[PDB]
Amino acid sequence: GSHMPEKKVAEAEKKVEEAKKKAEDQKEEDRRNYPTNTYKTLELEIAESDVEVKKAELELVKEEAKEPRNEEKVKQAKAEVESKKAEATRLEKIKTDRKKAEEEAKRKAAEEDKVKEKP
Numbered sequence: 001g002s003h004m005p006e007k008k009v010a011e012a013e014k015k016v017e018e019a020k021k022k023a024e025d026q027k028e029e030d031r032r033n034y035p036t037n038t039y040k041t042l043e044l045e046i047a048e049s050d051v052e053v054k055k056a057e058l059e060l061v062k063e064e065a066k067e068p069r070n071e072e073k074v075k076q077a078k079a080e081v082e083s084k085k086a087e088a089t090r091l092e093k094i095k096t097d098r099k100k101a102e103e104e105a106k107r108k109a110a111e112e113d114k115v116k117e118k119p
Contacts, residue, residue: 001061001074012058019051042095049088056081 001008026044033039056077064074 002065005065023048
């Protein structure tokens, strides 16, 4: 990392704020889809978990180069947030497992909506 590191953490924080803003767009789901209570939309929690690993990398860009440059501690912490990336990616399995489970024969072959595919 480094750069001062203040430079790298500040410029990447501006990015992590757009990342947070888009996860709040999927929160808009988890407050509009409460009405319906399908709300718990793993697409949100996937993005939010991986985005908070990205956040956590910016925190370690400080704790390398502010700092005693005990280079082992950023690297340790990368392996810990890599486990949290694996958790974000394990929710990516849950949205897929949901998708195949909630396919309650939606494709009745008589939905009429098929006209866009088979005119």
